[PDB]
Amino acid sequence: ALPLDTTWHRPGWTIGELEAAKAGRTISVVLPALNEEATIESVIDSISPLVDGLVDELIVLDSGSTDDTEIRAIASGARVVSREQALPEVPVRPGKGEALWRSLAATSGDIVVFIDSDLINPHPLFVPWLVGPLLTGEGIQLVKSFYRGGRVTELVARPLLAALRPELGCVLQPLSGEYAASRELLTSLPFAPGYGVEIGLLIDTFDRLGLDAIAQVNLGVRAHRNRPLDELGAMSRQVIATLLSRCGIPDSGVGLTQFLYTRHTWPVSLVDRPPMKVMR
Amino acid sequence: ALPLDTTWHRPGWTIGELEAAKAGRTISVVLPALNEEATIESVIDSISPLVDGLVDELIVLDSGSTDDTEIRAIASGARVVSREQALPEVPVRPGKGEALWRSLAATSGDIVVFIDSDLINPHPLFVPWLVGPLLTGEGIQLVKSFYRGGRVTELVARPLLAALRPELGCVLQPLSGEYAASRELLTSLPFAPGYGVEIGLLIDTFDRLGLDAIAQVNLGVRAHRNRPLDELGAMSRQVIATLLSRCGIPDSGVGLTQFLYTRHTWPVSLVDRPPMKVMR
Numbered sequence: 001a002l003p004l005d006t007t008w009h010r011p012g013w014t015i016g017e018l019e020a021a022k023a024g025r026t027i028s029v030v031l032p033a034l035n036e037e038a039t040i041e042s043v044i045d046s047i048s049p050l051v052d053g054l055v056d057e058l059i060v061l062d063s064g065s066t067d068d069t070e071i072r073a074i075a076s077g078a079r080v081v082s083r084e085q086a087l088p089e090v091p092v093r094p095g096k097g098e099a100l101w102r103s104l105a106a107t108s109g110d111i112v113v114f115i116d117s118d119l120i121n122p123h124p125l126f127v128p129w130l131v132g133p134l135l136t137g138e139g140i141q142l143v144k145s146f147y148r149g150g151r152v153t154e155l156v157a158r159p160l161l162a163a164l165r166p167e168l169g170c171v172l173q174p175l176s177g178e179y180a181a182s183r184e185l186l187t188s189l190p191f192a193p194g195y196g197v198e199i200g201l202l203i204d205t206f207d208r209l210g211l212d213a214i215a216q217v218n219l220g221v222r223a224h225r226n227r228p229l230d231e232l233g234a235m236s237r238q239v240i241a242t243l244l245s246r247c248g249i250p251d252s253g254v255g256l257t258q259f260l261y262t263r264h265t266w267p268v269s270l271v272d273r274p275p276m277k278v279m280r
Numbered sequence: 281a282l283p284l285d286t287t288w289h290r291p292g293w294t295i296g297e298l299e300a301a302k303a304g305r306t307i308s309v310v311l312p313a314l315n316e317e318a319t320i321e322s323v324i325d326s327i328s329p330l331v332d333g334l335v336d337e338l339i340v341l342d343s344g345s346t347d348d349t350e351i352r353a354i355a356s357g358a359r360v361v362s363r364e365q366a367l368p369e370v371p372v373r374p375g376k377g378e379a380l381w382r383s384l385a386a387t388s389g390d391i392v393v394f395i396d397s398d399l400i401n402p403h404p405l406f407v408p409w410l411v412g413p414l415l416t417g418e419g420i421q422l423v424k425s426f427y428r429g430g431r432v433t434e435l436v437a438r439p440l441l442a443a444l445r446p447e448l449g450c451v452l453q454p455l456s457g458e459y460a461a462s463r464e465l466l467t468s469l470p471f472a473p474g475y476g477v478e479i480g481l482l483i484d485t486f487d488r489l490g491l492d493a494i495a496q497v498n499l500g501v502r503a504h505r506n507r508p509l510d511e512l513g514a515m516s517r518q519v520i521a522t523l524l525s526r527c528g529i530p531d532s533g534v535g536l537t538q539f540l541y542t543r544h545t546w547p548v549s550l551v552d553r554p555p556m557k558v559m560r
């Protein structure tokens with residue numbers, strides 16, 4: 001391991017050991033989903049055998065899907081929750097960060113696990129491998145995954161971290177959509193909008209609790225949707241905006257423009273959601 | 281055009297018109313090269329027909345090649361200049377920015393044109409298309425190229441510019457290796473090290489002379505060496521470091537680390553070369 005608790009190899013914990021270690025703590029699993037009809041069922045099925053055992057609760061956080069995502073998830077026995085149902089007093093904003101933040105209001109596990117719903121054949125041990133350090137460690141409040149090409153991660157986020165928060169240089173996949181954390185931690189932190197949510201959570205956690213509260217576990221290999229370069233441009237812009245803000249640097253608020261030769265401007269947001277705590 | 285003089289279409293100027301417009305001004309062409317034996321001859325040949333006419337001078341700036349770059353360039357009739365010969369009183373540093381800066385001491389054109397030496401079948405009109413606005417415009421001191429996937433450009437540089445210098449959002453290929461500028465401008469500016477040199481030159485030019493001094497011309501389509509993702513990681517890191525510095529933001533000076541699972545740290549430099557002017 002580096003100065004960051006890193007599980008480099010297959011965790012050795014059995015499902016039954018992990019379950020014993022809960023000690024009254026509960027576990028929620030959240031799957032955010034926007035138009036993932038092709039992969040959603042495989043993801044739910046990888047995890048539903050854990051329900052009523054290690055996992056106390058599983059939801060799909062449907063983020064405005066217009067395909068068959070919701071019906072197929074229901075048919076896999078999952079509880080599907082819209083953004084509106086998760087938190088109906090508050091009008092819905094677009095983007096991933098909004099979905100995860102709302103999901104805090106729709107779950108009650110002491111521990112919350114996020115798994116992206118666009119994964120291709122995910123391992124059924126993903127969730128156990130992630131909760132290990134939270135269950136059996138001390139002071140770990142956040143566990144990030146890593147894996148084996150991560151264009152935004154390797155060109156934008158990791159190099160920017162080296163520039164502005166080099167202490168986090170040892171985190172191999174800071175933008176990974178698969179991770180777990182304590183409710184106490186998550187409901188105490190703001191949530192960046194859009195694709196800024198992961199990078200925001202990591203830096204805030206570090207700034208507030210330091211490295212000793214963070215672990216990372218090998219999930220082996222991951223496959224997912226490969227988005228077009230232009231969609232990555234918009235994602236990177238939001239990651240940059242969120243990353244700059246945590247480092248005390250003013251962002252223009254100006255969206256990325258691209259020329260296809262036609263021109264298009266993508267939205268960027270400088271507005272975080274506050275800690276879900278204030279909503280109590 | 282946008283607020284930035286943009287030549288969207290094939291320039292209409294003939295080689296003879298352009299030559300007339302020189303009016304005593306001279307033109308140097310510089311080809312930086314590090315191990316480009318496969319493509320260097322095609323690039324030189326695309327340009328050497330202009331020599332003693334529109335172009336007064338052509339050099340290859342050899343940046344420590346250990347392949348056959350120099351012998352093949354000589355065999356194409358090019359003058360080849362090492363980093364050491366360009367400026368022998370000053371010990372040589374690694375990276376592209378060093379090569380271009382040194383090239384100022386090895387040329388005397390009032391106008392300097394840079395063309396990367398790894399281009400696959402470059403158009404023989406590249407150089408005329410670039411000098412057009414400098415020759416026939418007023419107050420233009422810098423001309424950048426654009427083209428048609430630019431991973432570092434679209435994920436790192438363009439989104440970072442939108443964040444920190446949104447006025448430059450209209451520049452389509454800020455990192456393009458093909459561009460031209462006045463000696464008066466170039467010898468008045470510092471040169472960022474490594475791959476930071478292009479982004480550094482653009483921001484300094486803008487900060488010092490504003491947009492009205494900058495033009496961009498369509499070169500159509502370009503092909504070149506596609507580097508592995510890890511090499512791009514190091515390039516992006518240096519672009520970020522240089523970009524952050526021009527915007528008044530402190531960089532850690534810490535190199536990007538990558539885990540292949542073995543670990544490697546890449547060099548980054550926070551040291552610019554001063555304006556070549558001080559070397560007079």
Ligand SMILES: O=c1ccn([C@@H]2O[C@H](COP(=O)(O)OP(=O)(O)O[C@H]3O[C@H](CO)[C@@H](O)[C@H](O)[C@H]3O)[C@@H](O)[C@H]2O)c(=O)[nH]1
Nearest residue numbers: 032033034036063095096099116117118175176177195198
């Ligand atoms: O508005 C949205 C956008 C995405 N998602 C879901 O979020 C997950 C990941 O989104 P994706 O479009 O696949 O983003 P990636 O290109 O994969 O981005 C990677 O890097 C991002 C930057 O941190 C992370 O947010 C992602 O989890 C991570 O997979 C998917 O299951 C989506 O269904 C939503 O629920 N709502």
Ligand SMILES: O=c1ccn([C@@H]2O[C@H](COP(=O)(O)OP(=O)(O)O[C@H]3O[C@H](CO)[C@@H](O)[C@H](O)[C@H]3O)[C@@H](O)[C@H]2O)c(=O)[nH]1
Nearest residue numbers: 312313314316343375376379396397398455456457475478
């Ligand atoms: O130490 C070096 C490195 C590169 N080069 C030359 O510079 C040119 C471009 O370098 P390259 O390795 O192809 O960089 P790219 O991946 O193509 O980077 C693009 O984006 C960079 C960031 O601004 C620019 O520096 C480049 O010109 C541009 O092609 C090539 O002809 C090389 O021969 C050197 O002379 N010395």
Ligand SMILES: [Cl-]
Nearest residue numbers: 188189275277
């Ligand atoms: Cl608090």
Ligand SMILES: [Cl-]
Nearest residue numbers: 468469555557
């Ligand atoms: Cl000056």
Ligand SMILES: [Mn+2]
Nearest residue numbers: 116118224225
């Ligand atoms: Mn994905």
Ligand SMILES: [Mn+2]
Nearest residue numbers: 396398504505
């Ligand atoms: Mn190249």
